[PDB]
Amino acid sequence: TSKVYDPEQRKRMITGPQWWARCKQMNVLDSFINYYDSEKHAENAVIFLHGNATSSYLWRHVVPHIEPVARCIIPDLIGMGKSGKSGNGSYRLLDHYKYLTAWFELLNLPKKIIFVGHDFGAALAFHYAYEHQDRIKAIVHMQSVVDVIESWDEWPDIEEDIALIKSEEGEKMVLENNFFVETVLPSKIMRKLEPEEFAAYLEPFKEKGEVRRPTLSWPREIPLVKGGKPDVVQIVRNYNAYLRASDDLPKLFIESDPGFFSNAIVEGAKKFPNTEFVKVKGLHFLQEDAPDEMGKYIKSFVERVLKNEQ
Ligand SMILES: O=C(Cc1ccc(O)cc1)Nc1ncc(-c2ccc(O)cc2)nc1Cc1ccccc1
């Protein structure tokens, strides 16, 4: 089976260099963060968090829809995109969280922040919210790490694949063969990316070896109760319980159709009260198939949240 280019994409296409020229770099702890900042309307802040294999580039066609209503800030996570590397070479969830929260404290953020999370980027937003429950205005999430994996009731039995990624054979798949960037990323986009678009995802991880570590450390953080990292499992248990009780926190979930393990994620997402559910066509990286529909849904949601707090 093959995929085809979107014939109208090249006229709107934003290349890697075009995106990176719109970004800025700032020191954060012992390293630095590359990020996009739309600057205007700073009384609110909408922070977009990518997950594994991607970078701020993922949001490039989504964010213009929201910039007119609120300041939009989009980082490259540490070790990813054009950001600096982690000082100790470690890329666990808490390593990312350490750099991400240090970056927040330098951005002049409002008291209450809006988060937009994908993949493990949503796990970071959820953990931040659990630890700063008075700093959260709204949360948008999608194809997200919503809860632990405790059984195969909703999740397909992925045990054999998890054992693979945790093995030395999985390490070679990532560090030598770039599995998540070269294979998973295009497999989980419906359209075919333009060559320049794939090149922007490939560029941080173009060289073999240890530079690819973040794309191996992320799946090894999976919150599988039996065999997962117990510190990550606890983080996810804690913020899941918080989210299930957060009746007063308005949320938006963008379902992807047919998505990627969608059923398990939706069933977890349904347990969080005050969630508006919308749906777009896509797989895992739904930003690359329905960015304008997503941007419009997010814009209306933010507008509604702002109008009803006032
Ligand atoms: O890594 C995870 C973590 C997770 C996600 C959601 C959740 O409720 C609990 C834990 N899941 C995962 N589990 C399996 C695979 C996977 C499976 C097969 C394959 O060929 C490639 C990747 N990928 C992933 C990455 C992923 C999927 C969906 C949403 C976020 C992150």
Residue numbers in the entry: 2 to 311
What does the study report here?
To ascertain the role of the L9-α4 fragment in substrate binding, we tried to co-crystallize RLuc8 with CTZ. In contrast, mixing the RLuc8-W121F/E144Q mutant with CTZ yielded a high-resolution complex structure with coelenteramide (CEI), which is the product of the LUC reaction. Unlike in an RLuc8-CEI complex structure, the CEI molecule in our complex is inverted by nearly 180°, which allows its accommodation in the luciferase active site cavity. The α4 helix is in an open conformation relative to the α5 helix.
Here we track the role of dynamics in evolution, starting from the evolvable and thermostable ancestral protein AncHLD-RLuc which catalyses both dehalogenase and luciferase reactions. The regions encompassing the L9-α4 fragment and L14 loop are important structural elements that line the main access tunnels connecting the buried active site to the surrounding solvent. We conclude that the LUC activity benefits from conformational dynamics of the protein’s rigid scaffold to allow binding of a bulky substrate.
